[PDB]
């Protein structure tokens, strides 16, 4: 089976999510044919030279999955678009493009973070175009780390419902790639949607954010599974009752 996750928004202020992801990497992920992380792995990223210990702890945990024979892939989210090749080398992850077409047991599948489908938020897409301009990224990354951390903290303070996808953008993307299956995150609305693309039924599968429980999509030769699971090993104890 091939696994997909997104929208973990890892951060040191939410250690339960981190513990949940570490348990996922040490368990389920080790049995997978591959693991794809479709963006927003981290709640923030200001560049690979950031010494935040969480980054090294996550890199090491992913690298153990890779070393165990499970290739791991990353598509950037809007929170962590600055993840670069230094982190890719540290974690053993392979960085992919913003859209990729996969062969999953014969099923052709488009994968993407999903924010580019949200074409009714023209303000967001304009800002997105700016922070994805290479010369702007290179200027930001050249700033001292403490300056980047101040900029990012102010921006997060200033930003504190997610616009959903545009149905026509979905059809356009799925016809550009000639697929009947699309997996994405970003909208934080885990679901399976049927539509029509390329003159045939098509499906859009949406990952959940890791808010109170984890979420993954598991693709097998036989089916597509949207799975919700607890972060920690929920230890069984017997609550007494009476009838
Ligand atoms: O995502 C969703 C829901 C939609 C959410 C849409 N809002 C969103 O994404 N936000 C809002 C606040 C925020 C802060 C971060 S950040 O703290 O990591 N960091 C800020 C500084 N960044 C920067 C980079 C560059 Cl190149 C240039 C510049 C500068 F502006 F200075 F020029 C700054 C790098 C990134 C990352 C994402 C965001 N569902 O999935
Ligand atoms: Mn997200
Ligand atoms: Mn997002």
What is the CATH level 1 assignment? Alpha Beta
Q: Decide which structural class fits the backbone.
A: alpha/beta
CATH topology type = Purple Acid Phosphatase, chain A, domain 2
- Taken as a percent bin, the fraction of beta residues is 15-25%
- If strands are numbered along the chain, what order do they take across the biggest sheet? 4-3-2-1-10-11
Report the principal-axis shape.
Answer: globular
Helix content range of the residues, please?
25-40%
- In the CATH hierarchy, the architecture is 4-Layer Sandwich
Explain how this protein is built.
The PDB classes it as hydrolase/antibiotic. Keywords: LpxH, lipid A, antibiotic, Gram-negative bacteria, HYDROLASE-ANTIBIOTIC complex. It forms a monomeric assembly. Structure of Klebsiella LpxH in complex with JH-LPH-45. The protein has 7 helices and 11 strands. The chain has helices spanning 15-26, 53-67, 85-91, 122-131, 134-142, 145-159, 167-176; strands spanning 2-5, 34-37, 72-74, 94-95, 99-104, 107-112, 181-184, 191-197, 200-206, 214-219, 224-229. The chain has a 6-stranded mixed β-sheet. Strands 5-6-7-9-8 form a 5-stranded mixed β-sheet, covered by helices on one side. α1 runs parallel beside α2 (53-67) and α2 crosses α3. It is globular, with a radius of gyration of 19 Å. The chain starts with a strand and ends in a 14-residue tail after the last strand. The chain binds the ligand O=C(CCCCNC(=O)N1CCc2cc(S(=O)(=O)N3CCN(c4cc(Cl)cc(C(F)(F)F)c4)CC3)ccc21)NO and manganese (II) ion (2 copies).
